[PDB]
Copies of this chain bind each other. A is one copy, B any other.
Amino acid sequence: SLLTEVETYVLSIIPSGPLKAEIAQRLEDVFAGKNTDLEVLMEWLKTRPILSPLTKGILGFVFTLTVPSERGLQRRRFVQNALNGNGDPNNMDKAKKLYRKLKREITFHGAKEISLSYSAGALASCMGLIYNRMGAVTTEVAFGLVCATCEQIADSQHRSHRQMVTTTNPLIRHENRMVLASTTAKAMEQMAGSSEQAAEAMEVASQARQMVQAMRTIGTHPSSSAGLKNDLLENLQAYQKRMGVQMQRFK
C-alpha cells in the first residue's frame, strides 16, 4: 500500500506523546475523507509545541496533497520558510536537478530510491519547490520524496538514541522510574475506561499514581522506586490482560 507507507515515514519523525497520538488521528481522517478543512489544520499545526520547523513543514506538504479538494489557497508561510533550509546557495540547482528528475517518475519506490541517493537536506528544497509549482509531479512521487526526507531523519535518531550515554546519578534514575510509572498508569486509566469493568485496574493504576505523588511529597530515598513499573503491570496482569488490551509490551 501507499498510505500505510506514508504515515509510517511521517509518524516516525515526530516525538512521542499526545501530539503524535493526535496527529495520527488527523492523518487518519484526512485519508478516509471525513469532513475536514485545511486552514484549520495548518493553523493548529503552526501554534504547536515541540516540533522541528522542518517537521511542521513536511506535515504541511502532506496535508496539502491528501485533502479532498484542490484549494490552491495561499501557500502558508511556515512551510515555505521551513523547507528552504535558510537559503543554502549550494543546492539551488541540486534540488532543481531532482525536481526535473522526479518529474519523470510515475511510481513510488522509483522516487524514494532516487531521493535516498542524494543529500539529507536538499530534499527539503525540492519539497519547497514542489510546494510552489506542483504541476507534473504526481502525488505518489511526492510521497516517495517525503518518505525519503523522513528516512534520512529517522536514521539520524537511530544513530542518536543508540549512541546515548546512560545516567549514573540515582536522583535522575529515581525520577525516570516515577515518570514511566506515572505515565504508564495514566494510559491504563484510559485503556480501561473504554472497557466493561473499568473498576479494578483503573484503581490499581490510580494508586500507583498516588504512591508516586507521595514519594515526591515525602522526599523518599531513590531505592524505593526500584521495581515500580513492573510491579504495577503485575497487579493488573489479570484484569487489564484479557478484560483490557494486553501487557508485557509497555515495559
- Chain A residues with CB under 8 Å of chain B are 1-5, 7-9, 11-12, 15-22, 24, 28, 31-33, 35, 37, 39-40, 42-43, 46-54, 65-70, 72-75, 77, 86, 106-110, 113, 136, 138-140, 143, 151, 153-158, 160-161, 163-176, 178-180, 182-184, 186-187, 190-191, 194-196, 203, 206-208, 210-211, 213-221, 223-227, 230-231, 234, 244-246, 249-251
Bound: A31/B21 CA distance, A? 12
A171 touches B184 (CB 8 A): no
B24 touches A48 (CB 8 A): no
B109 touches A164 (CB 8 A): yes
For the complex formed, measure the closest distance between the CB of A232 and the CB atoms of chain B, giving whole angstroms. 9
**Nearest B residue to A204 by beta-carbon distance?**
B245
A3 touches B17 (CB 8 A): yes
B207 touches A203 (CB 8 A): no
Bound: A191/B184 CA distance, A? 19
- Additional A-B contact list (7), CB under 8 Å, known A18-B32, A108-B160: A8-B176, A50-B139, A52-B140, A154-B169, A155-B169, A158-B169, A211-B249
B190 touches A195 (CB 8 A): no
Bound: A69/B248 CA distance, A? 13
A215 contacts across to B, CB distance below 8 A: 249-250
